[PDB]
């Protein structure tokens, strides 16, 4: 989806294999705020939210707590105490076409900065003057959505990047989304120090 209408998916009731997505050797950027990524399979939470969208390579810096710009102020904001991960990689093969791809947009004009995890799809004409717009474009009445010029011959600076943000929410619920548990071989007829499931 576009960054201004990012898509959320709620993941629950399943055994997440976090350390396998860690070592894909595919993701250019992998960060984890508040949770160390080497200990992901032993801390388990109630719900995990996944948010996916597409931005350009120079704006990936903005997808982080405490950052400001155009993406972090009008499109997608993360709180100060975000606990989760941000994963991004370069998808110039799928999201750009010779001459450009004109199906990915981003909001450019807004009255005020977005609150954390707020999604807006309103397309009313932005009033940049004190003049009522009455829905007809012109001077001081601009359309708020600007397209991306995704051209395959750019640098990596303007090259498209796909971003997935995982939000590990913990409410006071018995934490259904837990990771895998290694189960060693079974040995018999020796004084052993067993630990069965419980």
């Amino acid at each position: 989806a576009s960054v201004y209408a990012w898509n959320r998916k709620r993941i629950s009731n399943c055994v997440a294999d976090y350390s396998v997505l860690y070592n894909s050797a595919s993701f250019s950027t992998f960060k984890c705020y508040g949770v160390s990524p080497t200990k992901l399979n032993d801390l388990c939470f109630t719900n995990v939210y996944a948010d996916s969208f597409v931005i350009r390579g120079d704006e990936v810096r903005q997808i982080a707590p405490g950052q400001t710009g155009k993406i972090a102020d009008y499109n997608y904001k993360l709180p100060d105490d975000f606990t989760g991960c941000v994963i991004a990689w370069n998808s110039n093969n799928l999201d750009s076409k010779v001459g450009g791809n004109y199906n990915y947009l981003y909001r450019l004009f807004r009255k005020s900065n977005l609150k954390p995890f707020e999604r807006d799809i309103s397309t009313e004409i932005y009033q940049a003057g004190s003049t009522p717009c009455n829905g007809v474009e012109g001077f001081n009445c601009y359309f708020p959505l600007q397209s991306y010029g995704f051209q395959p011959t750019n640098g990596v600076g303007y090259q498209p990047y796909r971003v997935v943000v995982l939000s590990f929410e913990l409410l006071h619920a018995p934490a259904t989304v837990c990771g895998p548990k290694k189960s060693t071989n079974l040995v018999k007829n020796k004084c052993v120090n067993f630990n069965f499931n419980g």
Partner: antibody
Amino acid sequence: QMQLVQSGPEVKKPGTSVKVSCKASGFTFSSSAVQWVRQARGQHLEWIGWIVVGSGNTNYAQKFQERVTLTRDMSTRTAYMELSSLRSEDTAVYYCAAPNCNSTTCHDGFDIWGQGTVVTVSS
Amino acid sequence: EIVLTQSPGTLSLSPGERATLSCRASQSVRSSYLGWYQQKPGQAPRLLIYGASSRATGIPDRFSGSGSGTDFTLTISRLESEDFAVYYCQQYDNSPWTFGQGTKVEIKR
């Protein structure tokens, strides 16, 4: 201070192409829009075109539609106009004008004006 | 795409008398998108009236436009030696933005 500082006088020859620029300073340039006009000596003002700083959308008159380009750079806050396929009937003073904007909502008329660059066309 | 005939052709009055310029459009325009500018000999023009009825900032209080439906006016309610210049009307409606011919004011001698 709210101002536009423009380039210097230029002398060009027919058939060539000319490029003029004006740099914004003293206000929030990233939300305003810039319009370009021209004037002969003692003649009426003529509207060349206009451009939005943010999106970059442009509009040109019918006379100049096929032989002018308007561009901008946010990094240095500069506006550029290129006029091509010159003729001797283009010797004039060129002005860029923009409204004073500060980042939230802004004025409803082109209040800020440049000092104009004199372009001479002669072989 | 818009015809803005300006009247009068020239204005010839002494310092103190009052003047009424006008800009006449051959089709309808909205008063929120018409502006009057003033250019003194040799300098860049400075905005005078925006919205056809709202003054600008720094302009004296004497100056005041009117701005009716499609037939716009400009009353200078006393003329100084500062006041002699050329004045233009521009329209901001989506059609090609046009200017008037421009009225020049000279001092009655």
